[PDB]
Swiss-Prot record:
Belongs to the glycosyl hydrolase 24 family. The lineage of its organism: Viruses, Duplodnaviria, Heunggongvirae, Uroviricota, Caudoviricetes. GO terms for biological process: cell wall macromolecule catabolic process; defense response to bacterium; peptidoglycan catabolic process; viral release from host cell by cytolysis. Changing G30F: Almost complete loss of enzymatic activity. The enzyme is destabilized by 1.5 kcal/mol. Optimum pH is 7.3. CDD domains: T4-like_lys. This is Endolysin. Disulfide bonds: none annotated. Changing D20C: Nearly no effet on specific enzymatic activity. It is found in: Host cytoplasm.
Length: 164
């Protein structure tokens, strides 16, 4: 299992504009379009993102393309970020996927503020980290997805996604 499949599970696939858990206009596999309330602003962003008049609808291939771009961005964001890079470098390949997942979901910026957890992760205090991660708005808002990522950091296996 890799970070692409993991995110495909957590985000779903939706071919028509929809609102995400925060009420923002999204399309595809968790591709945020605009935090603006206008359906018009969204469709506009959408069209600029795809390079065609989509009228609020995209194909599977278009969704997968957006997805690869967003994944690449999360990865490149971790590697460029002074707080995130050292953690990521310290992790094994499975836990690396978990960090990527957080970054895709909440942005570089958001993840970089979980200072305490990042430090635990680097020190490989898995249990302590799992506990600190859970005390967040993130966990309270999207508890099932957050448990899945937290278990991945805790055990270093794909158990939480093998169910699914």
């Amino acid at each position: 299992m890799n970070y692409f499949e993991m995110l495909r599970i957590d985000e779903g696939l939706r071919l028509k504009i929809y609102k995400d858990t925060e009420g923002y206009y999204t399309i595809g596999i968790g591709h945020l379009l605009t935090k603006s309330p206008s359906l018009n602003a969204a469709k506009s962003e959408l069209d600029k993102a795809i390079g065609r008049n989509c009228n609020g609808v995209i194909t599977k291939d278009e969704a997968e393309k957006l997805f690869n771009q967003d994944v690449d961005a999360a990865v490149r964001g971790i590697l460029r970020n002074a707080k995130l890079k050292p953690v990521y470098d310290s992790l094994d390949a499975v836990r690396r996927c978990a960090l990527i997942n957080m970054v895709f979901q909440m942005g570089e910026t958001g993840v970089a503020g979980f200072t305490n957890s990042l430090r635990m992760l680097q020190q490989k205090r898995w249990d302590e980290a799992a506990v600190n991660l859970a005390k967040s708005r993130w966990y309270n808002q999207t508890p099932n997805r957050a448990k899945r990522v937290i278990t991945t950091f805790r055990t270093g296996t794909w158990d939480a996604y093998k169910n699914l």
